[PDB]
Amino acid sequence: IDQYAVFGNPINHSKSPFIHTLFARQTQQSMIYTAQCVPVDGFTEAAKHFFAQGGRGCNVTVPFKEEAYRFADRLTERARLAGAVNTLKKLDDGEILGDNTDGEGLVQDLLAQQVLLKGATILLIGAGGAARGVLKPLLDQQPASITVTNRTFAKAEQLAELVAAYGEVKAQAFEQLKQSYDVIINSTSASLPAIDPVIFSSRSVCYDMMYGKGYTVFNQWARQHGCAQAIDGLGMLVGQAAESFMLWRGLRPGTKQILRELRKNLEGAL
């Protein structure tokens, strides 16, 4: 029985073991995925111990992703560009590979929802770690452009500079936004942003990284201002997990049927 885990949890409820346990059931994998505690002396020590005792891979949550990035011996392209690792994998030679599946999970959820990314104009709200992590995977989908926005312009400019060689990436402060976008992605945590609701057009699609019962505060706002479709982040959670699982096991699980169950649980497990 191969051992996998999640380290960290920035919230008080745990879904990763549920998700991965079901992926393992679907694909008949002899593995166990548990939630492991970061001890009081830190993540690095926890990771060292985990891999020394036979661990094969683990997910890492905020705020430990940068530490996981430093811990890894090797990094995937998307991890190196993200500056953060959410997935560690012990290779055959004992080296620890660091990956970041957050952006690809977002992309796959958007695609599962039949959102057209190729040639699309994308507005990315926020310029923090969550935003940084999803840029390269989105750019790989060949959008016409991505506009990074933040309350203060500088932070958005800095992020656009990092990824400038990969496609058309613009920076604009919240206050400057004055046109509509095909796809709007909210990467910011709950506080609404001082943005002109003109960003939402008749055919715009809104994606919130946050999730919960009913509609999120941001998606409620988007909907009230004429959004064509408001999607929450539950699918991104399952999508990122599926990418991690594929990295570890080389098998693609069934994301939709797990997303459906998570949604049933959010609405009451009735």
Q: Using CB under 5 A as the criterion, which residues of the chain lie in contact with Na ion when the complex forms?
A: 28
Asked if residue 14 binds a copy of itself (CB under 8 A), the reply is: yes
Asked if residue 45 binds a copy of itself (CB under 8 A), the reply is: no
Q: Which stretch binds a copy of itself (CB under 8 A): 10-18, 107-115, 195-203, 234-242?
A: 10-18
User: Which CB, 65 or 249, lies closer to Na ion?
Assistant: 249
Interacting residues with a copy of itself between 203 and 262 (CB under 8 A) = 261
Minimum Å distance from CB 32 to Na ion? 18
User: Which CB, 251 or 266, lies closer to Na ion?
Assistant: 251
Asked if residue 113 binds a copy of itself (CB under 8 A), the reply is: no
Minimum Å distance from CB 27 to Na ion? 5
Residue of the chain from 27, 35, 80, 229 that contacts a copy of itself (CB under 8 A):
35
User: Which CB, 90 or 249, lies closer to Na ion?
Assistant: 249
| 65 classed as catalytic | yes
Minimum Å distance from CB 36 to a copy of itself? 5
145-178: buried (b, 16+ CB within 10 Å) or exposed (e) per residue?
bbbbbbbebebbbebbebbeeebebbbbbbeebe
Minimum Å distance from CB 177 to Na ion? 48
28 binds, among Na ion, a copy of itself, none (CB under 5 to 8 A by kind): Na ion
How many residues are there in the chain? 270
User: Which CB, 34 or 158, lies closer to a copy of itself?
Assistant: 34
- Would you tell me which residues interact with a copy of itself (CB under 8 A)? 1, 3, 12-14, 17-18, 21-22, 25, 32-37, 39, 50, 53, 261, 265-266, 268-269
Q: Tell me which residues are annotated as active site.
A: 65
